[PDB]
Write a structure and sequence with these properties.
The structure is cut from a larger assembly and holds two copies of chain A. Chain A is mostly beta strands. Helices cover 1% and strands 26% of the residues of chain A. Chain A contains two helices and 29 strands. The longest helix of chain A has 4 residues, at 81-84. Chain A starts with 12 loop residues before the first strand and ends with a strand. Chain A: It is found in: Virion; Host nucleus.
Chain lengths: 549, 49
């Protein structure tokens, strides 16, 4: 029927402690998605080419030239942390838990209403009459077999809103068509020419045009219809909610000290380096903390700010996130920078068109690399080394002075042991489909829970076409009565977490909410203002430390 | 390492009217795919709206 509701709003999160320190977190989310009719209902590829930034000398990193198949379908993708958990729940599943894992996910569309707009004047100027529509349909094809390209909407910050008392927008589905880009590298104001800014014609081998109709089984939802996807059972690996602090110089037994401090100020001197035990990798006859043999290297030196280029233009190599260490290098360790919009945790009172940005400093303190205080000596170790026997971070590589050896040094070896980066709160991304390549990467720098078998189904929604009486299937104008609709979406994401074991003597670090002021954790942020302007800023994911080795 | 074929293998002397047959060796390999990939690093994920 039309005058009856086919669902129930539910948004709370349930903790269901199920024995020996195992929690069953069952996060429920529900929003009111606002579907509008597409711009055009034709599939069209639009090549984007910016010869206003890229033609300037030295702007290879300012290049976003590509090609995209633009489907007339909108995508309901709840793949962020802020959709499911409220900010008081990322404080309970960070201070108290020690390990999180994904269990299942089931989604549901109900309370669909579609309505058209008409024009009337009433004052000499046209106003809208929002007339109801009881026979129009909504098409809700979910893609559970993963034939279409995977476009996670947490990349363009286009997921559902994080506040449950707001209507959200559905993000339009579009994917990448494969054309060739050829850009020449150029430094700043070089006396020359660009000489290569060509975009290629479609190749015959790697061309994939994917229609949603010929691949999916579409359900036509009317006003009194509901849709439900079955529980997709995850097969991911657990991330830990405890950060590591032990660097490579704090692994193993510390050296035994011969003298002890009398007062509480001075330090205890160790055994002298000449008559000291242990193993080293060098040939010198003294053991120190620096040249001592350790089980494994903890953080690897990655070549930072390098731009590779292969058949699609220059792109930056993705760095594994790491800690900035006291000389702070937010780019040399790969600290991710966010550009989230106004329905994803910006201050609503921000009148400006610019987004709010946040550089995510990684909490794993052990695997971090101070780039300015690293060096390379000669193969026979002499201490102290001469001028031509050490490669510091002040010598130039090549002709250019600003490129030192830490930009080209890739020290990822067969005994590099690092932790995978933390789940970023609200504007993170929960899962990601593993790539279909024959040899897979070790991690994804966009999602903690890489699905081992199959990704959950992309839910693609659009409005069925409403036509006027004047219609020609030959060369037409596509009149198409102005329709829109709103539908409720409800998802349930089940999680499973393990509680903490208090082993230390001192109090551990906790994400406490401080008083109002200039601190980062003032309670005035997670609280609506006098006109109701919420903001959601990121929270620390791994407060408590753990022992690496 | 000096490896003689005589001291390591069991040799079959085939005459004119003799045959030899090895049993079915069962492979334990991994499947390669006969579909090539085209997506580079600048064509992964959702394109910008």
């Amino acid at each position: 029927g039309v005058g009856v509701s086919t669902g129930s709003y539910d948004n709370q999160t349930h903790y269901r402690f199920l024995g020996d320190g195992w929690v069953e977190i069952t996060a429920l989310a529900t929003r009111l998605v606002h579907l509008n009719m597409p711009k055009s209902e034709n599939y069209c590829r639009i090549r984007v080419h910016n010869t206003t930034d890229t033609s300037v000398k030295g702007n290879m990193a300012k290049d976003d030239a590509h090609e995209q198949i633009w489907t007339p379908w909108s995508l309901v993708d709840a793949n962020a942390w802020g959709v499911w958990l409220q900010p008081s729940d990322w404080q309970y599943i960070c201070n108290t838990m020690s390990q999180l894992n994904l269990v299942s996910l089931d989604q549901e569309i109900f309370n669909v209403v579609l309505k058209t707009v008409t024009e009337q004047d009433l004052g000499g100027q046209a106003i809208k009459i929002y007339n109801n529509d009881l026979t129009a349909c909504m098409m809700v094809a979910v893609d559970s077999n993963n034939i279409l390209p995977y476009t996670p909407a947490a990349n363009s910050m286009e997921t559902l809103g994080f506040y449950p008392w707001k209507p959200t927008i559905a993000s339009p589905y579009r994917y990448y068509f494969c054309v060739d880009r050829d850009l020449s590298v150029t430094y700043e104001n070089q006396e020359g020419t660009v000489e290569h800014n060509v975009m290629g014609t479609p190749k015959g081998m790697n061309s994939q045009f994917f229609t949603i109709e010929n691949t999916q089984q579409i359900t036509l939802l009317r006003t009194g219809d509901e849709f439900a996807t079955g529980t997709y059972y995850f097969d991911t690996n657990p991330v830990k909610l405890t950060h590591t602090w032990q660097t490579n110089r704090q692994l193993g037994q510390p050296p035994l000290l011969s003298t002890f401090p009398e007062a509480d100020t001075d330090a205890g001197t160790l055994t002298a380096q000449g008559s000291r035990h242990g193993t080293t990798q060098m040939g010198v006859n003294w053991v120190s903390e620096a040249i001592r043999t350790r089980p494994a290297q903890v953080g690897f030196c990655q070549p930072h700010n390098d731009f590779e280029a292969s058949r699609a233009g220059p792109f930056a190599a993705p760095k594994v996130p790491a800690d900035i260490t006291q000389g702070v290098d937010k780019e040399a360790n790969g600290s991710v920078r966010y550009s989230y919009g106004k329905q994803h945790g910006e201050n609503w009172a921000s009148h400006g068109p610019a987004p709010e940005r946040y550089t995510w400093d990684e909490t794993s303190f052990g695997s971090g690399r101070d780039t300015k205080d690293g060096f390379i000596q000669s193969a026979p170790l002499v201490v102290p080394p001469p001028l031509n026997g050490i490669l510091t971070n002040a010598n130039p590589i090549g002709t250019k002075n600003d490129i030192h050896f830490s930009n080209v040094f890739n020290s990822y070896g067969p005994l590099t042991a690092f932790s995978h980066p933390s789940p970023v709160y609200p504007q993170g991304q929960i899962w990601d489909k593993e790539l279909d390549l024959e040899h897979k990467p070790r991690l994804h720098i966009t999602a903690p829970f890489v699905c081992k078998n199959n990704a959950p189904g992309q839910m693609l929604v659009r409005l069925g076409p409403n036509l006027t009486d004047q219609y020609d299937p030959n060369g037409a104008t596509l009149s198409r009565i102005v329709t829109y609709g709103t539908f409720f979406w409800k998802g349930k994401l089940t999680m499973r977490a393990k509680l903490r074991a208090n082993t230390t003597w001192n109090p551990v670090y906790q994400v406490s909410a401080e008083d109002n002021g200039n601190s980062y954790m003032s309670v005035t942020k997670w609280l609506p203002t006098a006109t109701g302007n919420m903001q959601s800023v990121p929270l620390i994911t791994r407060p408590v430390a753990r022992n690496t080795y």
